[PDB]
């Protein structure tokens, strides 16, 4: 079949005129939707893909220059959607993948009908006037662990630093999956995430966005939802569910799945 499909492990499931595109967060793969896919195939056409950084993809295909910025991921999403004749899709994305889909909607408003976001964030690094993520001081430790791992792997030794070796107790959970790919790719993707700042660009997002957060989420502050709602250029709705952890759609499905299904099927936004 297509080289794009083989490169991104694209799978097409179900049937129907409406297509649902599921995008995992960084450090996981399309298998993170193993519990949501059964609830969708009976009434939606489901497209599952792995973005190029994922550990299930060929590390040779990973271009550091292309994927040092979010625009590369947005262009890859556009290319995948164009390859499979998908238009007006419903995109459900985890953290920082939904931001890539939002940028893609900025580029191609036609390809997207709505956006469902699970704990998104426009910028991950807190500033003086914006509290929507983590202090650069604590993300520096994660970057240092990734750099030490890459340095160890380059010399032929074992990369032995883990997210559980951090003392933040929230960076442990948030950065858990960043240690699930090749260390150099991990460093590149993590720096892309740290340098990301979509606050200027939120005004161009016109497609409706459905934001799903968690109650008192210790990783992504709940105020990010209100900030996004205010600064989005299209209709938006924020829902807070009683979940926890970095992967609610896999670890707590009996709570997360109904919320995602309701936001998929409700079109008012």
């Amino acid at each position: 079949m297509s080289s794009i499909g083989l490169a991104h492990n694209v799978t097409i499931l179900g049937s129907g005129e409406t297509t649902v595109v599921l995008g995992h967060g960084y450090g996981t793969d399309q298998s993170v939707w193993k519990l949501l896919v059964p609830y969708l195939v009976d009434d939606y056409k489901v497209l599952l893909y792995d973005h190029m950084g994922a550990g299930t993809t060929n590390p040779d295909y990973f271009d550091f220059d292309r994927y040092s910025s979010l625009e590369g991921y947005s262009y890859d999403l556009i290319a995948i959607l164009e390859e499979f004749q998908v238009s007006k899709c419903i995109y459900v994305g985890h953290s920082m993948s939904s931001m890539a889909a939002a940028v893609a909607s900025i580029f191609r408003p036609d390809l997207f009908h709505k956006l469902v976001m699970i704990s998104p964030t426009p910028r991950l690094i807190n500033t003086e006037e914006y509290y929507g993520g983590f202090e650069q001081k604590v993300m520096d430790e994660t970057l240092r662990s990734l750099d030490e791992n890459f340095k160890s792997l380059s010399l032929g030794t074992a990369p032995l630093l883990l997210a559980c070796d951090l003392e933040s107790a929230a960076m442990q959970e948030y950065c858990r999956t960043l240690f699930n790919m090749r260390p150099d790719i991990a460093c590149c993707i993590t720096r892309m995430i740290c340098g990301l700042d979509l606050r200027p660009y939120l005004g161009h997002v016109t497609v409706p966005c459905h934001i799903i957060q968690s109650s008192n989420d210790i990783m992504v502050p709940v105020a990010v939802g209100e900030y996004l709602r205010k600064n989005l250029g299209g209709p938006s709705v924020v829902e807070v569910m009683p979940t926890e952890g970095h992967l609610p759609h896999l670890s707590m499905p009996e709570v997360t799945i109904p919320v995602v299904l309701r936001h998929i099927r409700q079109d008012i936004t």
């Binding site: 083989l6 599952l48 074992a158 032995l160 883990l162 240690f179 790919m181 952890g245 992967l247």
Partner: protein, 641 residues
């Protein structure tokens, strides 16, 4: 005279004695005559390769009689896909490449694979079906196994011990053709993946359909809590229907579990601890009906009491008996004064395996040692009363023959006590299993010890092993470590490493099995203040690169709720440091980035991800494994020249 000048017949006789496949490959590269002789005399072949390049199959093995197709990459992938008309060519290709196959082992993922490959050899004698994935939904029962029944040949042995199906498929298939059942001499239904074992009625049907059986193994449902449990009537029917049985192995499905918590009555939440529907009189009748019995195993998870008289009848009515394995058979040996009784009267036993006997004391062990004086392999599991004195005395009694011992879960025998108790046979024991229980309260050269098996709880260190007594083992070539326990409640270990570097004490250690598959934790998301399984993988694999291992089987720990056994970054990084690995098998999943770490190993030849556990990853969207990743990894691995 030169070796090549010998007559070809005796040279072929020499070549048939070359069993190691590595040495056969070496010998095939000596000369044209040697290549021809090796290709003529190679009997067993285990096909290694990818499904994509199957049409590149070598045709030099025209004389192989045992063919094993269960390990073709991707492991467990369907060899034949029914949606493709081209799949019929695979059967012809296999028939042409290996025309003289009489024993076949194939991974029967789909019915089409069986229907296309198995009929290719009418003269097939033994068949082994392997399936760890889910059973496909069919119209009726037995349809998948009814494709086996060919009306142009005679199959003699069928092995379904690794073929997951429904327990009603087997009686349905055997009942559709009486000739096929009558031609069977061996039937291995001993699958631990059955959700429930065979019912009494199913066992009756299976035994009735197959009167000529010589070997019968089955995972039966003996628990009297469920309707249709196997009982006295089932055993009586087995004895009546198959008088010619030589091997009879019956076990409860939970008794076949890798995790001890599934069958151990101590570790079960009140499960078991209730008498099974088996009586001493019933066992007497069953043994009376089986005169040719040679190997007997009845591994139950429900107590049987006062079984001594039955085991006494065993000795008289079964003169050929050599092996006895008992599970939860109480009252096995209660000697009075100096009169032997129970299992101790079976003086012809060669191997005896005992599990969970509440009535056993030191005197029972002594009586077994004095009566079963030909015993060359003893195994005791979960006996709470036997202590070091009884075990040491029994070992001294059997000091001429005992070379295979296993002491597990015994309360009063820790590692130190077991190693002290095995003192009389220390210079003669070859295989040994002990539990790494360091907290149990209360010359030195293992000259012939070649294999050691260890069971240890999660989070326990291996370092006290050398101080326990296993110090000078000049011949130890293989050690198996099994780790079990729920680590979700444990805190971070105070010590950084498990202690695999403690195995540098043994110079000949080259093969290792590290089975951590029964560790339950959190895979990718720990809730809060918890540590995920990558920390434990690092803990249990630090220092593995220092050992000179040539072979390693590793079982990654699992998160039971998500049902995944992924390899993590520290595990792959530490396995990469094993520079002398020739074979590396990981019984779990690993994505492409971590699998590509293993290319740094210079001498690596056999690498595979074998998810031989139930249930297996169903598709590419359920785990991180991908078919393209496997193909690329194998292409790159077989490209290093």
């Amino acid at each position: 005279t030169a070796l090549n000048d010998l007559p070809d017949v005796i040279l072929s006789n020499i070549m048939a004695g070359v069993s190691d496949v590595r040495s056969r490959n070496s010998a095939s590269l000596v000369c044209h005559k040697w290549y021809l002789l090796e290709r003529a005399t190679r009997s067993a072949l285990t096909l290694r390769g990818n499904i994509r390049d199957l049409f590149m199959l070598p045709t030099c093995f025209q004389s192989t009689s045992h063919l094993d197709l269960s390990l073709i990459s991707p492991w467990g992938h369907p060899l034949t896909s029914a949606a493709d008309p081209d799949s019929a060519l695979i059967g012809h290709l296999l028939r042409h490449a290996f025309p003289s196959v009489t024993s076949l082992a194939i991974y029967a993922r789909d019915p089409s694979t069986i229907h296309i490959v198995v009929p290719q050899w009418p003269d097939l004698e033994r068949l082994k079906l392997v399936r760890w994935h889910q059973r496909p939904q069919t119209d009726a029962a037995g349809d998948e196994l009814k494709l086996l029944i060919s009306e142009c040949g005679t199959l003699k042995s069928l092995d379904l011990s690794s073929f997951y199906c429904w327990t009603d498929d087997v009686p349905a298939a055997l009942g559709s053709c009486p000739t096929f059942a009558a031609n069977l001499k061996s039937l291995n239904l001993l699958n631990s993946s059955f959700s429930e074992g065979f019912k009494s009625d199913e066992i009756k049907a299976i035994t009735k359909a197959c009167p000529n059986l010589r070997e019968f193994r089955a995972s039966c449902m003996f628990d009297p809590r469920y309707i249709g449990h196997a009982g006295d009537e089932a055993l009586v029917s087995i004895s009546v229907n198959c008088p010619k049985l030589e091997i009879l192995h019956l076990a409860d499905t939970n008794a076949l579990s890798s995790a001890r918590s599934d069958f151990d009555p101590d570790e079960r939440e009140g499960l078991g601890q209730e008498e099974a529907k088996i009586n001493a009189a019933t066992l007497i009748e069953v043994f009376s009906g089986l005169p040719l019995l040679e190997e007997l195993a009845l591994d139950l998870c429900n107590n049987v009491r006062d079984s001594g008289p039955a085991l006494e009848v065993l000795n008289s009515k079964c003169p050929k008996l050599k092996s006895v394995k008992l599970g939860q058979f109480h009252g096995i040996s209660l000697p009075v004064e100096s009169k032997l009784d129970g299992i101790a009267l079976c003086q012809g036993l060669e191997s005896l395996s005992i599990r969970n006997v509440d009535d056993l004391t030191d005197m029972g062990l002594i009586a077994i040692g004095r009566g079963c004086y030909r015993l060359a392999k003893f195994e005791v599991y979960g006996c709470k009363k036997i202590t070091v004195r009884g075990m040491r005395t029994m070992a001294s009694l059997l000091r001429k023959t005992l070379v295979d011992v296993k002491i597990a879960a015994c309360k009063k025998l820790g590692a130190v006590q077991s190693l002290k108790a095995l003192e009389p046979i220390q210079d003669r024991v070859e295989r040994l299993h002990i539990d790494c229980d360091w907290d149990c309260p209360d010359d030195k050269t293992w000259a012939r010890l070649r294999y050691v098996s260890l069971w240890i709880f999660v989070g326990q260190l291996l370092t006290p092993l050398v101080a326990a007594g296993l110090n000078d083992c000049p011949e130890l070539e293989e050690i198996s470590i099994k780790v079990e326990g729920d680590c979700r409640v444990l805190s971070r270990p105070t010590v950084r490493e498990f202690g695999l570097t403690t195995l540098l004490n043994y110079p000949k250690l080259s093969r290792m099995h590290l089975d951590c598959g029964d560790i339950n934790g959190y895979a990718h998301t720990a809730p809060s203040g918890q540590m995920d399984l990558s920390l434990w993988e690092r803990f249990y694999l630090i220092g593995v690169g220092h050992l000179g291992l040539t072979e390693l089987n590793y079982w990654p720990p699992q998160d039971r709720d998500v049902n995944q056994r992924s390899l993590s970054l520290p595990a792959a990084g530490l396995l990469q440091e094993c520079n002398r690995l020739r074979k590396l098998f990981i019984h779990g999943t690993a994505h492409e980035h971590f699998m590509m770490f293993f290319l740094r190993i210079e001498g690596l030849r056999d690498v595979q991800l074998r998810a031989d556990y139930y249930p297996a990853p169903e598709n590419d969207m359920s785990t991180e494994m991908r078919a393209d990743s496997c193909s690329r990894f194998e292409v790159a691995l077989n490209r290093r020249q």
